């Protein structure tokens, strides 16, 4: 699988809006993830205690993680497929320390698409969503390959 430049531009076009307030998008995405698939929250030893969306929105640390997460993803998307260097540290920590299965990466991918669909209809129509899905499928495919090399293959 390989995205076209046109598809990458649709991806970067909506990400540009995300960057107007990465912290806000991060909260929305993590909260959507945790509510749609509660089991995923259990992987966060530092945030597993949060009981409600209100507590999640009020968590300064969760907001910080959201920023760290989306900024790392943004750097990967901007590489337009040439993200080998960026994927190494991410795959190692998520495979060996956090133990995040591909199934959960699919869940957060679903969350990202849901939030962009809701917040950015102006830059997330059908074709743009297709481009983002293709970019995230590539991300997950390469991460999975790395997982396997690392001995996890979650
Ligand atoms: C878009 C996909 C994701 C990206 C780009 C991403 C990125 C990051 C980054 C940059 C960090 C900090 C550095 C590191 O430890 O590697 C991090 C930490 C972490 N990530 Fe991910 N992550 C993603 C998905 C997930 C998912 C789906 C889960 C589990 C449901 C997860 C769980 C964690 C945990 C538990 C930490 C540690 C948080 C803490 O500081 O307590 N990540 N992630």
From Swiss-Prot:
Positions bound to nitrite: 65
InterPro entries, alphabetized: Globin, Globin-like_sf, Myoglobin
Enzyme class: oxidoreductase
Reactions that this protein is recorded to catalyse: Fe(III)-heme b-[protein] + nitric oxide + H2O = Fe(II)-heme b-[protein] + nitrite + 2 H(+); H2O2 + AH2 = A + 2 H2O
Name of the protein described by the UniProt record: Myoglobin
UniProt family annotation: Belongs to the globin family.
Binding site for O2: 65
Gene3D superfamilies: 6.10.140.2100, 6.10.140.2110
Binding site for heme b: 94
Modification sites for Phosphoserine: 4
Role summary: Monomeric heme protein which primary function is to store oxygen and facilitate its diffusion within muscle tissues. Reversibly binds oxygen through a pentacoordinated heme iron and enables its timely and efficient release as needed during periods of heightened demand. Depending on the oxidative conditions of tissues and cells, and in addition to its ability to bind oxygen, it also has a nitrite reductase activity whereby it regulates the production of bioactive nitric oxide.
UniProt cross-references to SUPFAM superfamilies, sorted A to Z: Globin-like (SSF46458)
Residues where Phosphothreonine is found: 68
Limits of the Globin domain: 2-148
Keyword Heme applies: yes
């Amino acid at each position: 699988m390989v995205l076209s430049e046109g598809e990458w531009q649709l991806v970067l076009h909506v990400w540009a809006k995300v960057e107007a307030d990465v912290a806000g998008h991060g909260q929305d995405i993590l909260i959507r993830l945790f509510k749609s698939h509660p089991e995923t929250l259990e992987k966060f030893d530092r945030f597993k205690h949060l009981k409600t969306e209100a507590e999640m929105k009020a968590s300064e640390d969760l907001k910080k993680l959201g920023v760290t997460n989306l900024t790392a993803l943004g750097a990967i998307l901007k590489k337009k497929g040439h993200h080998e260097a960026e994927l190494k540290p991410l795959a190692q920590s998520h495979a060996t320390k956090h133990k995040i299965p591909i199934k959960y990466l699919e869940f957060i991918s679903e969350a990202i698409i849901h939030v962009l669909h809701s917040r950015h209809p102006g830059n997330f129509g059908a074709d743009a969503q297709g481009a983002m899905n293709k970019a995230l499928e590539l991300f997950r495919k390469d991460i999975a390959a790395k997982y396997k090399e690392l001995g996890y293959q979650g």
